[PDB]
RNA sequence: AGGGGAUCGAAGAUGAUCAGAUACCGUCGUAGUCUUAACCAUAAACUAUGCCGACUAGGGAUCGGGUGGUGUUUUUUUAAUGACCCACUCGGCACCUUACGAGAAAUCAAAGUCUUUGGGUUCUGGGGGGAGUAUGGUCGCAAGGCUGAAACUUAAAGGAAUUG
């Protein structure tokens, strides 16, 4: 059965992007796959998205605009202390000037590069580069 | 020779050492 | 690629194709840049100042370079009625 | 871009008709749905000729603008077309190959027939196969004529067309020479017929 | 997918399962039995003192062939019969 | 069994190629044409030769060989290759159209004379 | 297998190699000497080559 | 390795069929594999139908066939050349000759 | 003297190409080998290895050598060449010639703050050869390349000076973990970093800016 | 254990074959093969491929259901029904082509989305032997099933492909 709906999203658009898709459809929609793409989409990963409104759960359709290589989920959502952040960031991104592991804090889902400065942790949800 | 004779060795060879043991009863 | 004081290090900054907005690598030898004239007043088709567009090799051997171009053409004010956005 | 004096003209439309390259294939393949207008009862496939003339146009624009007019290669192994190609070729500085098409072309540079092309057009994907393979090993472009059901691989702009024989292949062939020369070249006055027949461009045997 | 629990408590059973498939590495087994204290023959210490017994002269295996020059010895801490060899040229008069 | 080697046939379909008007159909006379454009070792291949020359020219009299192409042929193909008639497009009573591909032309602005199937 | 072999020749060999007293010489220099030494010979004078140079050759080839 | 997708003949989605005996061996065969061939055949073969229609009574008749399925094992039909080898590749086609 | 037999192999040595990059731009087919030791001569060569393999005739056997070429500068191009022949002499010198041919450009970048001259890479990458898989890491500087002997030198001809290794599969097979260490570092400037999401307008291709003086007879 | 016991047929007997021939071939035939009431718990019990979820590609067949077609064919007059034809859509045993991708390869629409390594979950393996052995426990009337070592030994054992 259906267990991360967030982790089968970002899959769906792993294998659109890899196949020269340019918008795929996510269904189910979920609060914390709007938030994720949010982190996505300001960082210029994604394009434009949109909600659709069945009386439901939702579904997306994403834009995605080449340049994403791989939007992953972590499972799961593991605690991360503050000086373990880093350690993330080491192991599953490329270089240390570009890509995201976006978390999960108390005060809001965010990017750690972000999070580093709100002096924040928490849990982690994903990656985005 | 064959794993299925082997086998059927073994077996063989299981009973008779069966056997001996129970001559000390 | 900057660097220190702001200069362009690195080689060469790659091609993209214009499909999927891929790096064009430099041994992708399925990769095609069509060149498209631009025709002046009735006919007589301009040299020199064409309008080009990059696929990949990917796009290519996929069999969508054909609809990438139809659309790529209309956008581009080249083309009319023929691609459809909705299917 | 292109005016409105590139737009149908009902005298070419006339040809389309006539030589039955509206007649498409009962077999649709989904990368060329698009093309599909409508199906006919007892099953037969109607092309969108607007589109057909359209990407012809398109076609013509890109045969043009190529430099050197010998090296866009013109290409047919099949019969009904190999004569086409030949007349194409003749008007056109591109050189044509008709026959085989001889593995090892477009690659290896020692062979006795190393063209080095920079456009290359097809009659038809599937029994030209070979040379539009041989394209996408050297970064070769591709006009190509595509029947309904048809490959799409490593072909690029593509005129939708019949190949099923007659008129079809002759007339494409015909209206793309007729095209390149009003372009750039020596034709002018898009508005006028031409003096070369368009029986010009049919098979022989006879 | 991966065919293990990915769950956040599912700890006992990484660490149990790990510990049970800790006996398919022999090392590991031989530290656990105390196989060296029990079976072998020095007592897992690195070096025995015994007496010797008898001088053998063992051929050796395929596709060698020469006499390989040994003693019986008498383990003194354990009174195990054990054999070793003789190393060098003729360092087997060296010892009665 | 008598079948020419590669050799002789090399010889026979390169000079047909540049020095077909001067060959001929007669054997006797091939063979000494041979011994003006071409330097030969021994006197059998040179007969050779000269005798499967000879056998391409009674079969190209005859329609065109397979594989072999000279100028006077080439000519004889171009003439020949631009037969046109009164057109065959016409159209001697109007288009034919069934249905559906009348729909169309007329969902695409043009006039023509029409019909139905 | 068989324990029960020939100790008869126990050492054939090193009691049949005819003894050769060693040629004495002068002593080499130890410490920084000896590696000041290898400096310079391996690669300062630089003599014996072949497109790879060579340590320890015997009698070369001629 | 495996040498057909098929492994012997087509069950695919079953578990278990019925046995037949080769007519040749008597060998069981799953009825799933055995090569099968149909033989029709005439009582009077070709050679004679002269003499018997010739010496019959009725208007000519009308030969009668004899109706015979005949089900071989790999081993016999092998053997028998029923069947032959085929290259790696030959071996796909399912089309009969 | 050189004769140049195809188009890009003429607009070379006709000086209107100056630069190797040009032809790395436009993404093209180089098969003139003579076309990358004029864009890029004191260009260095290293034979790497030379192993027999064997085979079986006939009525007996037969036995040749086989040869594996590393080429390259210290700056951003590097090749890699096998070439098994009936000579060693041969084998090594058909070697070099695949190996040029086969010539590929290098995304170098920094570790982390950008310091004057690259000495890392760009991002992590790899490549797998049958079973064996390199991967390259960005290294600071000093690191130097980690990695091993054959790995180590195919890297200082692509001009780098940092770099962490790891490597999976059956290492010692040297003509395969060569091979995807090749592979890695041909995939630096494949993977699109947001240092080029910035759009361009697409060059001509020198075959048509000088398409003239790159045609034939 | 009772019934049954045509057929075929372990054991056994014979006839040949062979140097021998306890066999393969032929003949005879016990048990068995079938059933009822009890056991047994194993097979290459195989797709040698865990299950639930998602996503990634083209194609024509077919089984079951449904929908659409002033389609076809049936009477005495063409309405119902029946079967059939075309389109579509679920859910099935499969098949064809491709490779974006994967593999050591053979090959694979999963064995793909894995060093750009995390959807949930069960189970098993850790060089070859010794050995499925010994010991203990347990279940079975028995045969045996499940559970299951070590001493010592060994540099290979093994997979796919290649050319002879
Ligand atoms: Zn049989």
Request: with cysteine.
């Amino acid at each position: 059965t259906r267990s991360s709906v967030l982790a089968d999203a970002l899959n769906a658009i792993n294998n659109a992007e890899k196949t020269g898709k340019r918008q795929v459809l996510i269904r189910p929609s979920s609060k914390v796959i709007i938030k994720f793409l949010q982190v996505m989409q300001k960082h210029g990963y994604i394009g434009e998205f949109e909600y659709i409104d069945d009386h439901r759960s939702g579904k997306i359709v994403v834009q995605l605009n080449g340049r994403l290589n791989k939007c992953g989920v972590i499972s799961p959502r593991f605690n991360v202390k503050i000086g373990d952040i880093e350690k993330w960031t080491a192991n599953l991104l490329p270089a240390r000037q570009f890509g995201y592991v976006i978390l999960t804090t108390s005060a809001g889902i965010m990017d750690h590069e972000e999070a580093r400065r709100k002096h924040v942790s928490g849990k982690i949800l994903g990656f985005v580069y | 020779m064959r794993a299925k004779w082997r086998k059927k060795r073994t077996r063989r060879l299981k009973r008779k050492r069966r056997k001996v043991r129970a001559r000390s009863k | 690629m900057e660097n220190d004081k702001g200069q362009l290090v690195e080689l060469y900054v790659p091609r993209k194709c214009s499909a999927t907005n891929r790096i064009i690598k430099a041994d992708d030898h399925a990769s095609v840049q069509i060149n498209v004239a631009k025709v002046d007043e009735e006919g007589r088709a301009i040299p020199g100042e064409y309008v080009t567009y990059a696929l990949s090799g990917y796009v290519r051997s996929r069999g969508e370079s054909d609809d990438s171009l139809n659309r790529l053409a209309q956008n581009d004010g080249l083309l009319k009625n023929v691609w459809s956005y909705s299917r | 871009s292109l005016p409105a004096t590139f737009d149908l003209t009902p005298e070419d439309a006339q040809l389309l008709l006539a030589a039955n390259t509206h007649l498409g294939a009962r077999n649709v393949q989904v990368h060329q749905e698009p093309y599909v207008f409508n199906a006919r009862p007892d099953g037969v496939h109607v092309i969108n000729v607007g589109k057909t003339w359209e990407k012809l146009v398109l076609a013509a624009r890109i045969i043009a603008a190529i430099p050197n007019p010998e090296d866009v290669v013109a290409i047919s192994s099949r019969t009904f077309g190999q004569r086409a190609v030949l007349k194409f070729a003749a008007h056109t500085g591109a050189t044509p190959i008709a026959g085989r098409f001889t593995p090892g072309s477009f690659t290896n540079y020692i062979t006795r027939s190393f063209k080095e092309p920079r456009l290359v057009i097809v009659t038809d994907p599937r029994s030209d196969a070979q040379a539009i393979k041989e394209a996408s090993y050297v970064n070769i472009p591709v006009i190509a004529l595509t029947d309904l059901d048809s490959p799409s691989e490593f072909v690029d702009v593509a005129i939708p067309c019949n190949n099923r024989g007659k008129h079809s292949i002759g007339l494409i062939w015909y209206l793309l020479a007729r095209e390149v020369l009003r372009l750039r070249g020596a034709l002018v006055d898009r508005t006028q017929p031409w003096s070369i027949m368009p029986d010009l461009y049919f098979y022989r045997d006879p | 997918g991966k065919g293990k629990p990915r769950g956040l408590n599912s700890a006992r059973k990484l660490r149990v399962h790990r510990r049970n498939n800790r006996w398919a590495e022999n090392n590991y087994k031989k530290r656990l039995l105390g196989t060296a204290f029990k079976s072998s023959p020095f007592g897992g210490s690195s070096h025995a003192k015994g007496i010797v017994l008898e001088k053998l002269g063992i051929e050796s295996k395929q596709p060698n062939s020469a006499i390989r020059k040994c003693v019986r010895v008498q383990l003194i801490k354990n009174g195990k019969k054990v054999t070793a060899f003789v190393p060098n040229d003729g360092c087997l008069n060296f010892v009665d | 069994g008598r079948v020419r080697t590669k050799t002789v046939k090399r010889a026979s379909k390169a000079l047909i190629e540049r020095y077909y008007p001067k060959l001929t159909l007669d054997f006797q006379t091939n063979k000494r044409l041979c011994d003006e454009i071409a330097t030969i070792q021994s006197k059998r291949l040179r007969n050779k030769i000269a005798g499967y020359t000879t056998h391409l020219m009674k079969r190209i009299q005859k329609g065109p060989v397979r594989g072999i192409s000279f100028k006077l042929q080439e000519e004889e193909r171009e003439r020949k290759d631009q037969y046109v008639p009164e057109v065959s497009a016409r159209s001697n009573g109007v288009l034919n159209v069934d249905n559906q591909t009348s729909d169309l032309v007329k969902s695409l602005g043009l006039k023509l004379p029409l019909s139905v199937i | 297998a068989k324990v029960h072999g020939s100790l008869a020749r126990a050492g054939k060999v090193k009691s049949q190699t005819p003894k050769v007293e060693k040629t004495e010489k002068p002593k080499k220099p130890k410490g920084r000497a000896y590696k000041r030494l290898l400096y310079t010979r391996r690669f300062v004078n630089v003599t014996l080559v072949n497109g790879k140079r060579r340590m320890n050759p015997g009698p070369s080839v001629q | 390795p495996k040498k057909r997708a098929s492994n012997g003949r087509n069950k695919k989605g079953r578990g278990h069929v019925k046995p037949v005996r080769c007519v040749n061996c008597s060998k069981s065969i799953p009825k799933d594999k055995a090569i099968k061939r149909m033989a029709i055949r005439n009582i009077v073969e070709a050679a004679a139908v002269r003499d018997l229609s010739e010496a019959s009574v009725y208007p000519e008749y009308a030969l009668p066939k004899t109706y015979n399925k005949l089900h071989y094992c790999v081993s016999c039909a092998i053997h028998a050349r029923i069947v032959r080898v085929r290259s790696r590749e030959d071996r796909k086609n399912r089309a009969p000759p | 003297g050189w004769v140049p037999v195809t188009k890009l192999g003429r607009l070379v040595k006709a000086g209107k190409i100056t630069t190797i990059e040009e032809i790395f731009l436009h993404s093209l087919p180089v098969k003139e080998f003579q076309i990358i030791d004029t864009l890029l001569p004191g260009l260095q060569d290293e034979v790497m290895n030379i192993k027999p393999v064997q085979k079986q005739t006939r009525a007996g056997q037969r036995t040749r050598f086989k040869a594996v070429v590393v080429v390259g500068d210290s700056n951003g191009h590097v090749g890699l060449g096998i070439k098994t022949a009936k000579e060693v002499a041969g084998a090594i010198r058909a070697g070099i010639i695949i190996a040029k041919l086969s010539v590929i450009p290098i995304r170098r970048g920094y570790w982390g703050t950008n310091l004057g001259q690259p000495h890392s890479l760009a991002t992590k990458t790899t490549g797998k050869c049958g079973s064996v898989t390199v991967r390259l890491i960005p290294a600071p500087r000093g690191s130097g390349i980690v990695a091993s002997p054959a790995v180590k030198k195919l890297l200082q001809l692509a001009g780098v000076e940092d770099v962490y290794t790891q490597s999976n599969g059956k290492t010692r097979t040297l003509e395969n973990t060569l091979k995807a260490a090749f592979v890695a570092i041909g995939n630096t400037y494949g993977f699109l970093t947001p240092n080029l999401w910035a759009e361009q307008p697409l060059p001509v291709s020198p075959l048509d800016i000088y398409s003239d003086e790159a045609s034939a007879q």
